[PDB]
Copies of this chain bind each other. A is one copy, B any other.
Amino acid sequence: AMRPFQVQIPQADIDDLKRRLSETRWPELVDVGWSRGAPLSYIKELAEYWRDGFDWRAAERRINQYPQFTTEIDGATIHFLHVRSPEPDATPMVITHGWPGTPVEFLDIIGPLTDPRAHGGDPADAFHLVIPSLPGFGLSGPLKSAGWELGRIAMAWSKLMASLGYERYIAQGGDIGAFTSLLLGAIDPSHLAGIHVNLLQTNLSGEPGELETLSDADKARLAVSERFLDDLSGPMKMQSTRPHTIGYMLNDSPVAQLAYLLEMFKHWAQTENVPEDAVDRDLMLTHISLFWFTATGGSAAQAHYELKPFLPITSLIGRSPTLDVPMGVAVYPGALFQPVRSLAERDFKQIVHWAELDRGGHFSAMEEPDLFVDDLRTFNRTLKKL
């Protein structure tokens, strides 16, 4: 049974965040720009704005315009947005965030996807949207028990869609949400209209002849991963081994929680100089505040521990089980991993949609809502012609 939910942060918690922000003990660090983490000049000014200018209550209102629910599945609380189109025949779609994600990434796409008529679009392009928070993340709240490996998440998701009455839906996502959607392919193929992933990593099989078949451009695309592995993989390594330790390090300092996530907003998102290049500052702070207020820094960190075998820091080699479900792929230029189509085609036998976009990074929908919407609309048009 679905229990109506609204975000309502107690006033005392907001007061506590402001107190902690003004009392931050700022470290003495050398100025090397963003090279070793957020520079003091940037993070201090942002932290001050976070305290003095950011309007949490307004952000809370913007989120609460969307119907939300919580339900219990397999021993965990799951929070989700459920936004019905005014078109009854809209195509159901579950959009799943990854780490460090929240449904707030998707505020800018919800309107256009669910109500295209009101956004100058074709009413035939409508979706009904389900936007859940991963177990242990943000509004789903912290975990009371562990063991949430990918297959368990996928099983949960199929139960959710089934109990909402959706017998045919699209599974969409990036990062953890991409894996979840891909696993839905094996777990719930009879109810899956299609899978769409906006972040795809393609592994070499490890078999001899494969490399020779790749062009210089394919190989360069595979080597893109080297930036993440060398420079950006620290948080994933920490979370895949000691997520509790990360918890202690995020839960008791707002600036710690800020500084940690600024890494993704600077480098995972596609930026030039600052996070604001890619994402609106108030949206970013909304996203970040969710983690802080829900105190799920540590519980969310558990996901990397649970998904260790799937981590690119664990292995970049090996065929995935074959997948016959209609599939769409979107390649964002700033994505940390870049898929090679022929490697993708090796395992995924019904890729019906392959799009290469010219801007946007890791948080694709969040960074480039219009591109993302146009893309998903095109994909669904293709599905309907099958």
Measured between beta carbons, the chain B residues less than 8 angstroms from A230 are 241
Knowing A25-B251, A30-B146, A255-B252, the reply to whether A245 touches B38 (Cβ < 8 A) is yes
Those of A212-242 within 8 Å (CB) of chain B: 230-235, 237-238, 240-242
Tell yes or no: A299 within 8 A of B by CB. yes
Which residue from B24, B38, B146, B231 sits with its C-beta under 8 Å from A241? B231
Q: How far is the CA of A298 from the CA of B259 in the complex (A)?
A: 13
Which B residue sits closest to A314, measured CB to CB? Answer: B230
Tell yes or no: A174 within 8 A of B by CB. no
Measured between beta carbons, the chain B residues less than 8 angstroms from A43 are 248
Which residue from B28, B244, B252 sits with its C-beta under 8 Å from A142? B28
Which residue from B30, B237, B242, B297 sits with its C-beta under 8 Å from A36? B242
Tell yes or no: A164 within 8 A of B by CB. no
Q: Does A295 lie within 8 Å of B30, measured CB to CB?
A: no
Knowing A235-B238, A237-B233, the reply to whether A25 touches B295 (Cβ < 8 A) is yes
Which B residue sits closest to A292, measured CB to CB? Answer: B25
Tell yes or no: A249 within 8 A of B by CB. yes
Which residue from B38, B258, B298 sits with its C-beta under 8 Å from A244? B38
Measured between beta carbons, the chain B residues less than 8 angstroms from A28 are 142-144, 295, 298-299
Number of copies: 2
* Chain A count of residues within 8 A CB distance of the other chain: 52
Measured between beta carbons, the chain B residues less than 8 angstroms from A145 are 30
Q: Does A245 lie within 8 Å of B263, measured CB to CB?
A: yes
Measured between beta carbons, the chain B residues less than 8 angstroms from A25 are 251-252, 295
Tell yes or no: A32 within 8 A of B by CB. yes
Q: Does B248 lie within 8 Å of A37, measured CB to CB?
A: yes
Q: Does B29 lie within 8 Å of A244, measured CB to CB?
A: yes
Beyond contacts A36-B305, A37-B246: 6 other A-B pairs, Cβ-Cβ < 8 A, are A25-B252, A27-B248, A39-B244, A234-B242, A238-B238, A256-B256
A to B CB contacts below 8 Å, 21 in the list:
A25-B252, A27-B247, A27-B251, A29-B142, A29-B244, A30-B144, A30-B145, A36-B241, A36-B242, A36-B243, A36-B245, A36-B302, A37-B242, A37-B247, A38-B245, A234-B234, A234-B238, A238-B238, A249-B250, A249-B253, A252-B253
